[PDB]
Amino acid sequence: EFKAGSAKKGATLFKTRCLQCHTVEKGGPHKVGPNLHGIFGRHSGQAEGYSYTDANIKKNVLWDENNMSEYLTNPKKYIPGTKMAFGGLKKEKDRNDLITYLKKATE
Ligand code: HEC
Ligand SMILES: [Zn+2]
Ligand SMILES: [Zn+2]
Numbered sequence: 698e699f700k701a702g703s704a705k706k707g708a709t710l711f712k713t714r715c716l717q718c719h720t721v722e723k724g725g726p727h728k729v730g731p732n733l734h735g736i737f738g739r740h741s742g743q744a745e746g747y748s749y750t751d752a753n754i755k756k757n758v759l760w761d762e763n764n765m766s767e768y769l770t771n772p773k774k775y776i777p778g779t780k781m782a783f784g785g786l787k788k789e790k791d792r793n794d795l796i797t798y799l800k801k802a803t804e
Contacts, residue, residue, distance in 0.1 A: 699762040707798025721802040736760050736803045752778030766792045
């Protein structure tokens with residue numbers, strides 16, 4: 698299950714693995730992937746002005762720390778048909794660290 702990790706390690710993981718396709722700040726632009734502001738507590742496939750796949754919308758997951766960890770373990774396994782071209786974060790340490798950071802960065 699999800700447990701709070703290191704947000705500093707999380708921020709680096711975000712910069713090096715996620716930032717190329719995602720912004721986190723309020724009003725931040727959409728890039729290859731949607732801006733993630735307010736992602737926790739919002740259903741999947743609902744960021745304003747972003748064109749998602751039917752699969753992402755269909756999943757209809759209410760994003761929380763635990764399901765985000767499961768999704769980030771392997772995105773294509775959790776949401777079959779996703780256009781998010783990312784293999785996943787295989788270490789639970791990395792997922793805990795990234796999510797601790799993301800919970801704050803996207804608030
Ligand atoms: C580009 C090559 C991407 C990288 C690198 C990462 N993400 Fe991604 N993500 C991307 C796209 C194109 C999409 C839309 C997928 C679709 O099928 O429509 C996404 C989506 C997400 C989501 C869900 C958004 C939502 O439901 O509103 C999340 C939570 C997400 N991406 C997180 C995320 C993180 C934390 C990553 C780094 C570890 C990451 N993404 C990398 C494209 C790309
Ligand atoms: Zn719901
Ligand atoms: Zn906010």
